[PDB]
C-alpha cells in the first residue's frame, strides 16, 4: 500500500497536468470532473456546482455543513507549457499549481479519504465526519463565481483557506484592494500641428507623479499601502493628439489605510477624474479558540500576507477562519514554482487532529 | 460666376453622399463608378484602374499624358452619419469631404467638361486638351495604391495636387513624416508585490521624456521637427505589473532633419525597441515658370505647410508641381468640415487660364 504522503504528491501531479488557467475554462471544468471521479472511486460523496461556468466541489459530512472546512482552488495563473509537466527533484515537486494551489486540493482529498476510511472501519459514515472540503475554480480572479457562491451554502465551525502562509505562519491578516480608473482629458489636435493640442497622456503622467506621493512609505517587510499602474489606454490614430487617457491602478491597503479616506485624498491630489472599479476588504481573522488550538497543534505563529484570497468571503458569511499552507519558498506565480514535499506532514498532522477533536 | 460654380457645389454634394471611408471600400469603389458614369454622360473619355481595392480615375487628353494635371482624392476620413448629408448655409458647403477633398474632384471634372465642350464647339477634341485629371482613392492612408501607381504612368508638364494650401497660398514645401512604434519590456509581477516587477509603462514614460529632448528646437512659425505620442497601450489585468508597453509616435521633419539620422538618434536615445511603421519624405517643389505664372494669375504667394499629401510622389516620378486648394478654414478631419463656396472661382479661373496658355 502507498503512503498518504505519496498519494498526495501523485494526486497533486495529476491535477497539475490540467492547464486550468482562465483562458482554458474547459480545463478548469475537466480538473473538477477528475476530482469528482477521484471522490467516487474512493466511496466519497461529493457535490459539484457550476456558476457562470466556474465549478466548485463540496466534500462535506452532509449537505450544507462541516466542522472544519478546508478551502482550496484548482484554477492556476498562466504558465508556459513545460510547467504543466510535474516533476520531482530532490525533496521538491515542481510545476504550476505545486504550491498555488493544487497540493492543497490533493492534501484535503487524501485527508478526507483517510479519515472516512477510518470511520467506516468503526461502523461510522460520512455524516460522522467533522472535516469538509470546498474546492473552487476562480480564486485567482477574485472568487465571485466560486467561493462567493459556495460559502453561503455551508455552515462551518471553522475554515482554513489552504492557500497562503507556510508551516510556521498562519495568516490572520491580508492586504485589501482598491482598483481605480483615472481619466485625464486633454485637447485634440492634428499630429502635424501638435502644439495646438494638449496631450492627455502627458496629463496622466503628471497625475501619476502626484498619485505616487501618496505611496511614499517604504519598509523592509513592505507592510504599507502600494500602488501599481496595471493598464493604460489612450488614442487611436497615430497622427492625432489624444484628448482622453485612462490608467487603471491596483492599490493595496493595510488595515490602517481607510479606503474611503484614501479615495478622498487621491481625488484631491490628482486633476483627472477617479472612478472606483472594485474594492476588496482587508482580511482580519476573528479571534477564535480554534485558531488558538491550531497554533498549539502546529507550533505556527500568526502572520500577515500581501495578497488577498478567498478568505475575504468568510466575514460576509459570518464564518471564522484563517489562511494557511505548506512550504513553497515564496515561488508562487513564478517559473520556479515548487512545493517542499516533507512539509505536507506539517499541515496534515495538525489539521487531522483538529478535525478529530471536532468530531462527536 | 456663381451659377457656373454652382455646378461644382452640386457635384461635390453628390460626391459627399458616398461615405468613402477606408472601412467602406465598396463606397470608395461606388464613388469612383459615379465619376466614371458622370464622365461618360458628359462625353468625356475616362479610364479606371484599381490596386488592392483602390481606384485611380484618369481623365487625360491622350493615353499617358497631360499638360496641366490636377490630382485629387475621393477617400475621406471617418465621420458620423450626419456628415454625409451635404448642406449649404452662409456661403459654405458642409460635410465630410467638402474641403478634404471632394470639392477638388468636382472642380477638376467641371473644369474638364467646361473646356472640353468649348473645344468641341470649336471643332477640336479631347486630344487637344491641356488639362488632365488624376482622381485617387487612398490619399488619406498614404497613396501607395493610388497616386504611387498612377503617377509613373502619366507624363505631365505641371501638376497641381488640389489638396492643401488656400487661395492665397500655393504650397511649395511640406514636412515629411516618420511614424514609429516604441516597445518597452519590463518584468511581470503580481500587483500585491509590485516591488518584484519592473513596470513597462514607467519605462515607456521615461523613454518618452527622453524622446522629447530630441525635439527641443523652437521658432515662431513652428518650422522644425515635432513629435506626437498618438497612442499608448499596456496591460490587460489591473492587478499585474505590465511587462510590455507600446507607444505610437507621429514625427514630422523639415528639409533640415535627415530621417535616417533622426531614426538612428532616436534608437540610440531610448531604452526600448523602435520599429518604423512608415516614412514619408519632405516635399520640396521644383522651381518652375509654371509656378511663377500660377502665382501671377492667382495673386497667391508661395508657402509651406506642416501636413503632407500625395505631392510627395512627384519628385520620384520626375514631375514638377505644387499643392493648392480652395478655402476650408482648416476644418479638415473635423465635425465642422466645410468649403467656402465663393473661393471656388478663385481656383477655377487661374487654373483654367494656365491650361489655356498651355494649349496656346
C-alpha span between A246 and A233 (Å, rounded): 5
Strands B92-94 and B87-89 come out as antiparallel
B173 and chain A: CB distance < 8 Å anywhere? no
Residues of A in contact with B241 (CB under 8 A): 228, 230
C-alpha span between B296 and B350 (Å, rounded): 9
Measured CA angle at A309 (ends A254, A280), to 5 deg: 50
For residues B310 and B169, state if they share a domain.
Answer: yes
Rg for chain B, CA atoms, rounded? 23
Best residue in A229, A246, A305, A333 for a mutation probing chain B (most B CBs within 10 Å):
A229
Helix B25-41 vs helix B102-121: crossing angle, to nearest 10: 20
Q: What is the DSSP letter of B299?
A: -
Q: Report the half-sphere exposure of B321 (CA within 13 A, side-chain side).
A: 31
Cis amide bond preceding B109, omega within 30:
no
Select from B281, B303, B321 the last residue of a domain. Answer: B281
Given the C-alpha cell 521633419, which residue does it identify? B253
Name the H helices within B270-330: 289-298
Residues of B in contact with A250 (CB under 8 A): 191, 194, 238-239
A91: left (phi over 0), alpha (psi -120 to 50) or beta: alpha
* B17, B82 Cβ separation under 8 angstroms: no
Helix A4-16 vs helix A102-121: crossing angle, to nearest 10: 140
C-alpha span between A162 and A111 (Å, rounded): 13
For residues B23 and B108, state if they share a domain.
Answer: yes
* Backbone phi, psi, residue B32, to 5°: -60, -45
Please name the residues between 304 and 323 in chain B that touch chain A, using a CB distance below 8 Å. Answer: 306-308
Closest C-alpha to B177, from B38, B245, B276: B276
CA distances from A260 to A210, A257, A266, B115 (A): 19, 9, 10, 75
Residues of A in contact with B306 (CB under 8 A): 190, 192-193
Q: Which residues contact A332 (CB under 8 A, 6 or more apart)?
A: A99, A100
* A102, A96 Cβ separation under 8 angstroms: no
Task: Judge residue A301's burial from the number of C-beta atoms within 10 Å of its C-beta, 0-12 exposed, 13-18 middle, 19 or more buried.
Answer: exposed
End-to-end CA distance of chain A: 30
Domain with residue B271: its CATH number is: 3.30.70.360
Best residue in A217, A230, A234, A330 for a mutation probing chain B (most B CBs within 10 Å):
A230
**Grid coordinates given for B122:** 470649336
Beta carbons of B250 and A191 less than 8 Å apart: yes
Cis amide bond preceding A101, omega within 30:
yes
The total domain count for chain A is 2
For residues A179 and A274, state if they share a domain.
Answer: yes
Structural domain range at position B202: 175-281
The shortest CB-CB distance from A192 to any of B232, B235, B252 is to B252
Beta bridge partners of A156: A66
Distance from CA of B74 to the nearest CA of A (A): 20
Distance from CA of B231 to the nearest CA of A (A): 4
Residues of B in contact with A240 (CB under 8 A): 228, 230
Rg for chain A, CA atoms, rounded? 23
C-alpha span between A154 and A161 (Å, rounded): 14
Q: Which helix (H) or strand (E) holds B278?
A: strand B273-280
Task: Judge residue B10's burial from the number of C-beta atoms within 10 Å of its C-beta, 0-12 exposed, 13-18 middle, 19 or more buried.
Answer: middle
Chain centroid to Cα A128, Å, comes to 30
Residues of B in contact with A236 (CB under 8 A): 231
Given the C-alpha cell 459556495, which residue does it identify? A150
Distance from CA of B54 to the nearest CA of A (A): 21
Domain with residue B157: its CATH number is: 3.40.630.10
C-alpha span between A72 and A138 (Å, rounded): 10
For residues B112 and B187, state if they share a domain.
Answer: no
C-alpha span between B284 and B303 (Å, rounded): 11
Which chain A residue shows the shortest CA-CA distance from B278?
A238
Beta bridge partners of A75: none
Distance from CA of A229 to the nearest CA of B (A): 7
C-alpha span between A35 and A135 (Å, rounded): 9
Closest C-alpha to A72, from A44, A41, A111: A111
Residues of A in contact with B179 (CB under 8 A): 238-239
**Grid coordinates given for A179:** 482598483
B156 and chain A: CB distance < 8 Å anywhere? no
Largest CA distance in chain A: 86
C-alpha span between B125 and A210 (Å, rounded): 73
* A203, A254 Cβ separation under 8 angstroms: no
Name the H helices within chain A: 4-16, 25-41, 102-121, 147-150, 200-212, 259-269, 289-298, 343-358
Please name the residues between 80 and 119 in chain B that touch chain A, using a CB distance below 8 Å. Answer: none
The shortest CB-CB distance from A250 to any of B179, B191, B307 is to B191
Closest C-alpha to B71, from B161, B164, B172, B170: B161
For residues B248 and B152, state if they share a domain.
Answer: no
For residues B21 and B140, state if they share a domain.
Answer: yes
Q: Which residues contact B63 (CB under 8 A, 6 or more apart)?
A: none
Q: Which helix (H) or strand (E) holds B273?
A: strand B273-280
For residues B137 and B23, state if they share a domain.
Answer: yes
For residues B163 and B181, state if they share a domain.
Answer: no
Measured CA angle at B165 (ends B160, B166), to 5 deg: 105
Closest C-alpha to B312, from B322, B300, B324, B302: B322
**Grid coordinates given for A343:** 512539509
For residues A119 and A240, state if they share a domain.
Answer: no
Chain centroid to Cα B339, Å, comes to 16
Buried b vs exposed e over A276-297: b needs ≥16 C-beta within 10 Å? eeeebebbebeeeebbebbbee
For residues A202 and A344, state if they share a domain.
Answer: no
* Backbone phi, psi, residue B22, to 5°: -70, -25
Chain centroid to Cα B149, Å, comes to 15
For residues B243 and B354, state if they share a domain.
Answer: no
C-alpha span between A212 and A133 (Å, rounded): 42
Q: Which residues contact B348 (CB under 8 A, 6 or more apart)?
A: B4, B5, B8, B107, B110, B111
Beta carbons of B229 and A190 less than 8 Å apart: no
Q: What is the resolution of this structure in A?
A: 1.6
C-alpha span between B22 and A350 (Å, rounded): 68
Closest C-alpha to B152, from B288, B312, B314, B310: B314
* Backbone phi, psi, residue B243, to 5°: -100, 0
Select from A244, A262, A281 the last residue of a domain. Answer: A281
Select from B258, B281, B304 the last residue of a domain. Answer: B281
Q: How was this structure determined?
A: X-ray
C-alpha span between B249 and B230 (Å, rounded): 6
For residues A252 and A335, state if they share a domain.
Answer: no
Amino acid at each position: 500500500g502507498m503512503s498518504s504522503m505519496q498519494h498526495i504528491v501523485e494526486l497533486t501531479s495529476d491535477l497539475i497536468r490540467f492547464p486550468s488557467m482562465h483562458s482554458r475554462p474547459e480545463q478548469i471544468s475537466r480538473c473538477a470532473g477528475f476530482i469528482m471521479d477521484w471522490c467516487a472511486q474512493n466511496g466519497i460523496h461529493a457535490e459539484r456546482m457550476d456558476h457562470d461556468g466556474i465549478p466548485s466541489v463540496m466534500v462535506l459530512p452532509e449537505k450544507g455543513r462541516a466542522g472544519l472546512l478546508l478551502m482550496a482552488h484548482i484554477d492556476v495563473v498562466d504558465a508556459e507549457d513545460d510547467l504543466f509537466v510535474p516533476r520531482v527533484e530532490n525533496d521538491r515537486l515542481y510545476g504550476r499549481g505545486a504550491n498555488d494551489d493544487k497540493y492543497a486540493v490533493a492534501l484535503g482529498l487524501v485527508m478526507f479519504r483517510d479519515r472516512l476510511n477510518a470511520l467506516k472501519a468503526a461502523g461510522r459514515s460520512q455524516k460522522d465526519m467533522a472535516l469538509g472540503l470546498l474546492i473552487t475554480g476562480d480564486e485567482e480572479i477574485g472568487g465571485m463565481n466560486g467561493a462567493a457562491k459556495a460559502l453561503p451554502l455551508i455552515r462551518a465551525d471553522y475554515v482554513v483557506a489552504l492557500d497562503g502562509g507556510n508551516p510556521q505562519q498562519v495568516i490572520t491578516k491580508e492586504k485589501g484592494i482598491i482598483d481605480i480608473k483615472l481619466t485625464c482629458t486633454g485637447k485634440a489636435a492634428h499630429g502635424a500641428r501638435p502644439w495646438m493640442g494638449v496631450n492627455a497622456v502627458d496629463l496622466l503622467m503628471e497625475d501619476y507623479t502626484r498619485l505616487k506621493t501618496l505611496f511614499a512609505e517604504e519598509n523592509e517587510d513592505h507592510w504599507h499601502r502600494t500602488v501599481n499602474l496595471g493598464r493604460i489606454r489612450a488614442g487611436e490614430s497615430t497622427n492625432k493628439v489624444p484628448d482622453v487617457a485612462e490608467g487603471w491602478f491596483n492599490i493595496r491597503v493595510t488595515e490602517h489605510d481607510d479606503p474611503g479616506a484614501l479615495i478622498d485624498k487621491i481625488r484631491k491630489t490628482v486633476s483627472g477624474t477617479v472612478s472606483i472599479v472594485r474594492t476588496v476588504p482587508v482580511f482580519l481573522a476573528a479571534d477564535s479558540p480554534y485558531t488558538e488550538r491550531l497554533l498549539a497543534l502546529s507550533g505556527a505563529t500568526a502572520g500577515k500576507a500581501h495578497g488577498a484570497s478567498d478568505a475575504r468571503y468568510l466575514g460576509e458569511n459570518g464564518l471564522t477562519g484563517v489562511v494557511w499552507g505548506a512550504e513553497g519558498f515564496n515561488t508562487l506565480h513564478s517559473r520556479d514554482e515548487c512545493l517542499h514535499i516533507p512539509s505536507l506532514q506539517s499541515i496534515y498532522d495538525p489539521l487531522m487532529q483538529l478535525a478529530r477533536e471536532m468530531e462527536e
